[PDB]
């Protein structure tokens, strides 16, 4: 029974890996963008919190 449950565990592990990678890539791209907008166009002009 425990091995059967561990199979589902591994499935959930793969799911979590997918999501973690997606988020990590999003953050990497976002950081690159931030480094590219050091020109001061980001502080309010890009970041219209509205």
């Amino acid at each position: 029974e425990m091995e059967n449950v561990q199979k589902k565990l591994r499935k959930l592990e793969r799911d979590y890996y997918q999501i973690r990678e997606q988020v990590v890539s999003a953050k990497a791209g976002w950081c690159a963008v931030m480094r590219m907008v050091k020109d001061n166009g980001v502080e309010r002009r890009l970041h219209r919190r509205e």
Binding site: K7, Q22, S25
Partner: protein, 135 residues
């Protein structure tokens, strides 16, 4: 409807598709006369920065042949554009040798599932073997 339809994007896609087809030499126009076809093409070229009028140009001079290919290409382009956002929704293109593809396709129609599903079942059986070896 699962994919949001964007007018100013699909219109540009359509204009680019028409221009590509014409420059490929195909008769996008429905006109057999050379002069009317040339005039319609010239106007379409002018319509570069006005994708909105491209729909009207379509309704006025588009060749009746192209409706199916148009609605197919733009539908697929929309699907691909929305899927490319995330990796887990992306697609990977691979090439297979004829014997291998023949066996794989035969197996898939036997199991009545898509190629990806058949590969999933196969790799899952191999990984199940690995797991039972591990436990």
């Amino acid at each position: 409807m699962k994919y949001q339809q964007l007018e100013n994007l699909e219109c540009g896609w359509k204009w680019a598709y028409l221009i590509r087809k014409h420059q490929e030499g195909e008769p996008i126009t429905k006109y057999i006369e050379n002069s009317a076809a040339h005039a319609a093409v010239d106007k379409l070229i002018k319509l570069e920065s006005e994708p909105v009028r491209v729909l009207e140009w379509i309704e006025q001079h588009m060749n009746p042949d192209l409706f199916n290919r148009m609605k197919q290409t733009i539908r697929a382009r929309r699907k691909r554009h929305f899927n490319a956002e995330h990796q887990h929704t992306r697609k990977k293109s691979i090439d297979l040798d004829f014997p291998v593809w023949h066996r794989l396709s035969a197996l898939s129609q036997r199991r009545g599932n898509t190629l990806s599903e058949t590969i999933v079942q196969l790799i899952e059986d191999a990984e199940r073997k690995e797991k039972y070896a591990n436990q």
